[PDB]
Amino acid sequence: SSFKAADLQLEMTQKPHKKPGVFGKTFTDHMLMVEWNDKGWGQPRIQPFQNLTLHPASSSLHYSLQLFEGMKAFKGKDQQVRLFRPWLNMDRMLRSAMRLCLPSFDKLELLECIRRLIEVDKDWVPDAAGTSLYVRPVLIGNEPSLGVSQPRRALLFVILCPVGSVTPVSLLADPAFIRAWVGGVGNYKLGGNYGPTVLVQQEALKRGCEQVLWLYGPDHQLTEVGTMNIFVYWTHEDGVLELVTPPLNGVILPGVVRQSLLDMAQTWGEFRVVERTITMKQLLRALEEGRVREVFGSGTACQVAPVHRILYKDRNLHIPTMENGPELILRFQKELKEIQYGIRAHEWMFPV
Amino acid sequence: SSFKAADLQLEMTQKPHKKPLVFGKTFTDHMLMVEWNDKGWGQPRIQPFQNLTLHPASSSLHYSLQLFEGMKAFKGKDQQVRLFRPWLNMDRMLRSAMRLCLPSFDKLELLECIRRLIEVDKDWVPDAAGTSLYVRPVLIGNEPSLGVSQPRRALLFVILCPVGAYFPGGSVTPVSLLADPAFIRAWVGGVGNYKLGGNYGPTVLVQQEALKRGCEQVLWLYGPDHQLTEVGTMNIFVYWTHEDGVLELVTPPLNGVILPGVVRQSLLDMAQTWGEFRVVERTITMKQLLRALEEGRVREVFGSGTACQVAPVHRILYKDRNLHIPTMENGPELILRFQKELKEIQYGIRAHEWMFPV
Ligand SMILES: *Cc1c(COP(=O)(O)O)cnc(C)c1O
Ligand SMILES: *Cc1c(COP(=O)(O)O)cnc(C)c1O
Known part of the structure; x- marks a missing residue:
């Protein structure tokens, strides 16, 4: 038994x-x-x-x-x-x-x-x-x-x-490499998921970036950051301030911290907290219109990881996370630190 | 170095x-x-x-x-x-x-x-x-x-x-395949075309899901058009008369989801040297097969690996409906020929x- x-x-x-x-x-x-x-x-x-x-x-x-x-x-x-x-x-x-x-x-x-x-x-x-x-x-x-x-x-x-x-991280957004697939095993913490990432990780270090941003599908969906889930604090195209993270549909690993940040943000009820698909198109436009506040990764290794730069198709996208506080990040960390210690x-x- | x-x-x-043993x-x-x-x-x-x-x-x-x-x-x-x-x-x-x-x-x-x-x-x-x-x-x-x-x-x-002997006596038993598109072995831009342990672990649950539905091995479908990729730990071949109305041997091409099998390559090389029928590497869909079966154009379907040199396929369970593959009624000529020549070369x-x- x-x-x-x-x-x-x-x-x-x-x-x-x-x-x-x-x-x-x-x-x-x-x-x-x-x-x-x-x-x-x-x-x-x-x-x-x-x-x-x-x-x-x-x-x-x-x-x-x-x-x-x-x-x-x-x-x-x-x-x-x-x-x-x-x-x-x-x-x-x-x-x-x-x-x-x-x-x-x-x-x-x-x-x-x-x-x-x-x-x-x-x-x-x-x-x-x-x-x-x-x-x-x-x-x-x-x-x-x-x-x-x-x-x-x-x-x-x-x-x-x-x-x-306290330092932000640079991400490589190369759609050539696929971490996981829908109907795969991306939503389970199996060693099989990581072996392939090692080559892609060192390919990022050799292009200046620190960690990898994992894109999925033809529409280039933002899934995960190396060994962390991804969040985006921004004003959506509908013109409402929300916190969005990719939903659990097989490619996303259900992070303990990810779930904790959603639960914590939901209990506040001060802004919208949704699990919706995020594309590069949506982000490129959101950056162009200056709607993006903070982008960060959540894992055990890094509780709340600020993202300042994303290299996508030989073009550097500046993420204005640190210019916007980062308010939500500093808040999340503070409350997590109080709870944990x-x-x-x-x-x-x-x-x- | x-x-x-x-x-x-x-x-x-x-x-x-x-x-x-x-x-x-x-x-x-x-x-x-x-x-x-x-x-x-x-x-x-x-x-x-x-x-x-x-x-x-x-x-x-x-x-x-x-x-x-x-x-x-x-x-x-x-x-x-x-x-x-x-x-x-x-x-x-x-x-x-x-x-x-x-x-x-x-x-x-x-x-x-x-x-x-x-x-x-x-x-x-x-x-x-x-x-x-x-x-x-x-x-x-x-x-x-x-x-x-x-x-x-x-x-x-x-x-x-x-x-x-995978088949005792020289005579060969065919295998039943489960064609469930819900399960994906590999993805384009993945690592399906490399023999890494990571590719196999996930298959064990899908394999036992086949055993409990009557089927013996898994048929791995990929894409919305349901492309036939691999059979468990073997590459897939189809001996048939194509829609153009010519006898050919077809296998899925090496595009990332297919593992480049040594035997797969050996069967292509061997069939090419004969020059008796057409030997191509083209995408095979379930639609193409369902029609080819309906029009009785399919001769032999088989898998190729080291474990099993030439594996006859007689049945495929797809969308809760059993498709009979007439491999054994057609000899199987090409399979028996491939095995015979491979056995002569190898031993x-x-x-x-x-x-x-x-
Ligand atoms: C380990 C891991 C995480 C972090 O999981 P938490 O439970 O949030 O610490 C996130 N993404 C991937 C791909 C991981 O392997
Ligand atoms: C191991 C394996 C084979 C067999 O390859 P050969 O070199 O032909 O023996 C075929 N397909 C898959 C998916 C495999 O894992």
Whole structure:
């Protein structure tokens, strides 16, 4: 059925790594690990940070039967650690698992195991300004077989990273490259979605841009920004101030922060908050008519990323985000910072 | 620059096992292994069949920085092993590597390493009817980092499997296909035309959705006009009399959604050398097929891959309606011919430039 938090074994480290005096390069001393097979879910293990022992014909390495998740744990002023809406990360992880025919589990049980893991490495969580602990739960197929079938053996593991912007980012809008397709798997956080992006990412760095803007369809629809969802604060063609983000139709990943920004903006009710398709045509005109206020990306890595420049077909489009405050961005960050670092009590935060 | 066959180290096993079977579950005693890092390509290693030791943040397991290849080694009557057009598998592997920002290597050097590996496990190659050794070269990223970037560290390894007749007795069973346009394998400007693991993971759910609707494999439709692209892990062919009223063999052209199959190319080359009928690479729609079936113009529909050289198709389930494909009633002449000549070429009965001796 599922692994239990009650059966959790604790093997403490006898070779603890040095704490720092760089995103996802420094790792903590401990990692969660649960195996699945014909018999079912084994006992969950909090083991020291070891290497993985995989069969050369492991489905994870051959047919990309792999999925992951990204959520942050914030140590507040009272020095109590809290996870930001971890339930939505657990929801999206199970939806990913069912898509790749990997074993289903109890969401609340895995959360408790991740809670206990962070409890053990409690000292690894930084309490510095704009710093957190990045949680990386992973589920992979591990059947020793080259058959493209439902894996008989799987492996769920979690690893932690201490992590450390006021600066805006430049985007490359090249329609030649397609991240995901309607009826694809773009709306699941599967490794398969990322491998292809690495070439497109370095093609952006070599054209001056920092991150990629992913266009889809002949009408060149704005979908995502690298590993972030996209928002546009602007006065629409109807002449009404709205916040718009592409809707969940298969190409867009349902971001936890994306959903949090919509929920937060809806509760204000001060301006219109819609999920509608955004085309380059709409933006080029909106920029021409000076209707665009702020463009930004939302992810775990970057909570609210200001966008100042977009390179599209050898022409630089200046986005006037920073000239317009950026009001909405600074507001979102402020309230998120208050919620996350415990300054303001909220139902979203899950205490360790 | 690249690893060399001259620097190849040989660590022999000391526990050779089995030699009895099901596809890609039984493995040989030895495996090739070359590591890449900042310094560059290390010495290539023929080691015993061990497990892999990967960092928990290995790019291969997180961001699917992984690609593979599939080619067969055929032990002839003279008991000499030969690889079927291995150069094209090496070409497609390098094109895959460049797409995922993985290190480029010398194609001829890796082939020589794979040749030496099969030379060591020469006894593992079966000489039974319709049996071969399946070769599985793999290249993965192995940088201990959660950054979505070009991997600083990689790992190239090759493993071997003895495999059985896809069709026992020489006689061939046909397959049922599910044509559901709701599911999309690849997209134009995607990575469908590269043999990357990322392309396959999503197919497993669509494959079991076919099994539970009676069908055996999936037919992948693309676009609003419902273009026939691929069959599961095989390219698709249609032997028929076209609307112009001429007998032709047609397969979807290489435009990003189609993987350039070694066998696909081999069937085109072989049919072109005959010059007995028209051989074209043109888009095939369901409309064209539904009409061609209605007018009884369809002779044979089949899939081509390494696993299945020539797969007969007898049934296609499309919009909750079963389309009968008259492949088996028409011989199948072209299929049986293709298999016969391929079998003669591969098992050494007929000498050909395509075969590479071990
Ligand atoms: C991880 C990721 C995001 C961010 O997800 P959040 O839950 O909002 O942190 C956005 N887009 C893509 C493509 C991603 O992979
Ligand atoms: C692996 C694969 C094939 C087989 O390619 P060959 O080189 O002909 O063996 C065909 N189509 C798809 C989609 C594949 O993934």
